Amino acid sequence: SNDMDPSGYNPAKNNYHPVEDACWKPGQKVPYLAVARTFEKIEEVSARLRMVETLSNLLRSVVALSPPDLLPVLYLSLNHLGPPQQGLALGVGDGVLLKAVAQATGRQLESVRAEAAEKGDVGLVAENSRSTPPPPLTASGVFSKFRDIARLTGSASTAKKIDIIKGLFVACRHSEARFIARSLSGRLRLGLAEQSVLAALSQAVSLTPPGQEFPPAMVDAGKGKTAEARKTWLEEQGMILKQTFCEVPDLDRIIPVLLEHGLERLPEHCKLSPGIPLKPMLAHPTRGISEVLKRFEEAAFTCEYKYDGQRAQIHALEGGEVKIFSRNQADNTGKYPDIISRIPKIKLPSVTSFILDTEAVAWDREKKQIQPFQVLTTRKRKEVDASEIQVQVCLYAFDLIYLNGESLVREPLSRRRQLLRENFVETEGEFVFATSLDTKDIEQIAEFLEQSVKDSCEGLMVKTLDVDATYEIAKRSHNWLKLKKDYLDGVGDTLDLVVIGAYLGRGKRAGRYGGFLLASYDEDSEELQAICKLGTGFSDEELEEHHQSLKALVLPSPRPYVRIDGAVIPDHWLDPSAVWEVKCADLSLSPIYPAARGLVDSDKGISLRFPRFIRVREDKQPEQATTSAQVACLYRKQS
DNA sequence: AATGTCTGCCC
DNA sequence: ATTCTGC
DNA sequence: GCAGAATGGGCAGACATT
Ligand SMILES: *O=P([O])([O])O[C][C]1O[C](N2[C]=NC3=C2N=[C]N=C3[N])[C]([O])[C]1[O]
Numbered sequence: 115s116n117d118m119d120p121s122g123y124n125p126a127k128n129n130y131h132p133v134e135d136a137c138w139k140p141g142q143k144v145p146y147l148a149v150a151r152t153f154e155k156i157e158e159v160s161a162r163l164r165m166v167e168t169l170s171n172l173l174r175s176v177v178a179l180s181p182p183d184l185l186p187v188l189y190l191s192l193n194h195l196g197p198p199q200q201g202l203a204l205g206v207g208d209g210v211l212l213k214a215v216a217q218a219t220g221r222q223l224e225s226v227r228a229e230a231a232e233k234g235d236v237g238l239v240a241e242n243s244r245s246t247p248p249p250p251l252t253a254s255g256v257f258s259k260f261r262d263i264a265r266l267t268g269s270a271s272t273a274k275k276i277d278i279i280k281g282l283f284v285a286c287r288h289s290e291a292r293f294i295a296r297s298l299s300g301r302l303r304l305g306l307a308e309q310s311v312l313a314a315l316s317q318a319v320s321l322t323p324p325g326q327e328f329p330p331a332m333v334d335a336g337k338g339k340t341a342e343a344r345k346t347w348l349e350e351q352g353m354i355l356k357q358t359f360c361e362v363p364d365l366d367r368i369i370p371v372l373l374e375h376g377l378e379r380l381p382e383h384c385k386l387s388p389g390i391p392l393k394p395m396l397a398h399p400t401r402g403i404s405e406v407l408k409r410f411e412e413a414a415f416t417c418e419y420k421y422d423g424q425r426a427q428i429h430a431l432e433g434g435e436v437k438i439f440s441r442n443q444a445d446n447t448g449k450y451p452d453i454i455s456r457i458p459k460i461k462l463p464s465v466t467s468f469i470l471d472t473e474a475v476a477w478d479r480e481k482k483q484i485q486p487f488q489v490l491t492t493r494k495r496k497e498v499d500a501s502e503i504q505v506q507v508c509l510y511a512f513d514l515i516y517l518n519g520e521s522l523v524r525e526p527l528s529r530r531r532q533l534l535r536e537n538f539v540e541t542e543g544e545f546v547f548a549t550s551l552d553t554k555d556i557e558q559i560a561e562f563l564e565q566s567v568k569d570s571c572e573g574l575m576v577k578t579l580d581v582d583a584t585y586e587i588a589k590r591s592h593n594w595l596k597l598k599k600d601y602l603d604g605v606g607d608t609l610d611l612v613v614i615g616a617y618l619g620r621g622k623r624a625g626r627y628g629g630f631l632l633a634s635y636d637e638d639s640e641e642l643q644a645i646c647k648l649g650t651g652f653s654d655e656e657l658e659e660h661h662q663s664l665k666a667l668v669l670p671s672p673r674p675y676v677r678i679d680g681a682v683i684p685d686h687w688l689d690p691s692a693v694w695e696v697k698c699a700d701l702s703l704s705p706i707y708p709a710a711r712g713l714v715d716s717d718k719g720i721s722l723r724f725p726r727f728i729r730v731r732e733d734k735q736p737e738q739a740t741t742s743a744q745v746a747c748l749y750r751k752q753s
Numbered sequence: 754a755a756t757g758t759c760t761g762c763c764c
Numbered sequence: 765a766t767t768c769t770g771c
Numbered sequence: 772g773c774a775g776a777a778t779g780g781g782c783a784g785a786c787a788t789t
Contacts, residue, residue: 162774162775267785268785269786269787270787272785304775307774307776308774308775309775398772488782491783492782492783494783495784590772591773619777623776623778628777629777646779647779647780648778648779649778698779702780704780704781705780705781705782706780721779721781722779723779723781724779725779726778
């Protein structure tokens with residue numbers, strides 16, 4: 115009966131009925147166009163609550179009509195390929211994608227490239243493209259082609275990905291090509307990501323319980339509730355799903371349990387366990403110690419060195435298997451044979467399993483001192499052998515999430531940290547507890563902040579010990595504070611840099627400039643040397659003003675005294691004129707930027723770590739910008 | 754063999 | 765990673 | 772304050788090209 119064309123699917127309508135308002139039939143694969151139309155409706159709105167309801171409508175229809183497609187539809191909505199620990203990646207960026215578009219349309223790659231840049235969205239290019247009879251795309255078919263792309267490996271694999279991609283585009287109808295392309299480029303731009311997908315899912319399976327006989331007698335379990343009881347109930351079901359997901363961020367595990375046992379019984383089937391990465395506790399920036407004392411009020415807190423390495427979530431399973439996961443739940447085990455072989459040394463004989471929250475820091479065993487993050491990044495990644503490791507690592511342990519088969523997630527940090535100290539064993543330069551200070555005295559805190567930089571850290575992490583001090587990400591994901599010198603007004607490295615070029619903006623930046631190429635003044639050669647790009651720190655209004663004043667400085671070709679070497683050629687070369695104050699966290703030795711090359715190193719120039727716009731220096735012309743010699747001086751002052 | 758470009762993921 | 769902003 | 776979307780530098784690895 116339901117022969118509604120998916121082109122008319124409207125998951126945003128009032129009084130959405132999961133069966134009758136779907137654009138597909140019970141037992142039919144969810145059409146990809148149904149997902150694209152949901153994306154369109156989500157795009158058109160800015161209230162996340164409207165977005166969540168719209169997605170929820172789609173999901174309720176999937177649960178009611180096509181339950182096996184729930185997982186692909188969710189992954190499509192998250193724009194992921196599977197669980198984060200499986201390390202599946204498309205291996206497709208704008209390069210492979212635009213080359214695929216060019217072939218599907220007959221156009222030259224430069225033309226497509228130029229249009230994508232101007233429109234700021236590869237989706238608009240693929241959609242408005244003449245594709246110089248295939249069945250309609252389904253959600254699971256598209257999902258599975260994405261996974262086919264990601265699995266393609268070896269010589270000629272790029273051509274094989276382009277072929278799959280072209281096959282997708284030739285079957286696309288209406289808005290499908292826009293979202294296929296946006297999916298492949300990695301930016302859906304819905305205004306809706308993981309938190310809203312979770313809210314939509316918990317809402318969907320609460321209103322339309324999975325697993326009923328068809329047609330479901332219970333299509334809207336909110337209908338018997340007052341508005342206020344409905345809100346309270348959806349919030350509680352949502353919290354169940356979110357807290358479970360933060361401990362087990364694996365839809366492949368969660369969805370079957372959801373579909374079979376329902377959401378209220380989810381915690382009984384999915385729990386934190388070693389070997390499945392969990393979502394890490396994150397930190398909010400603070401702009402000074404006073405801000406720390408106020409945000410925390412009367413809560414006792416501790417300060418810890420903020421080490422400059424990579425987060426390493428170390429799992430030791432019952433039975434001895436050791437896994438190491440990144441901050442993003444990627445499996446880094448194969449990267450760290452040195453750490454696996456040192457686990458025996460770090461725990462008492464009674465420790466049978468754990469999840470440790472640590473920072474892996476590059477460590478010079480000769481000098482017994484910390485090495486910079488840049489050195490850490492020269493470690494091999496895949497399938498590393500333990501004897502060939504050149505850059506040793508020292509683990510700085512700061513949290514214990516799971517111990518001897520018990521979750522510590524609801525334990526306050528005071529207790530988790532005590533359990534860390536009591537059950538684990540320090541070895542200098544191999545595994546040590548984060549340097550810490552428990553105080554509320556500004557003097558000691560300021561001094562400790564100073565000491566951490568002198569001890570080659572970035573600053574401090576500040577964490578309450580007992581008040582709201584648990585590790586429950588679903589309750590507050592940014593429960594910690596980070597205090598870095600470069601956050602403090604007038605403390606960090608600031609530079610005055612010449613804007614030499616602009617890059618057309620993507621997404622909401624389309625039609626203006628999203629980034630800028632900046633240069634220092636090389637006094638000796640009287641040239642401007644590219645030092646970094648810049649794309650954060652301006653309000654939207656400033657960004658519109660920058661575009662409006664700088665488009666008048668656009669040059670057809672660059673000045674001959676403007677050296678950019680390996681930096682990305684700007685979309686618009688700009689007459690050097692505008693001078694901007696830029697803050698950064700650090701200077702780095704750069705493989706591409708020419709700024710100050712030969713003043714520290716004969717071949718490498720210098721770039722900025724985490725540059726951000728502070729303000730225009732309308733009082734300066736290019737010759738008053740920070741010089742390359744000063745950039746070198748700053749770099750050496752880092753020691 | 755060597756080099757250059759693209760990508761994913763660290764921050 | 766930093767930063768901005770509509771809700 | 773959340774959640775999301777803009778955006779930064781730079782590495783190893785995987786390919787492509789020569
Ligand atoms: O938000 P940021 O990504 O800048 O910082 C969080 C990040 O810092 C790392 N870290 C180092 N030392 C730490 C620590 N986190 C928590 N406690 C201590 N002592 C860690 O990798 C975080 O992800």
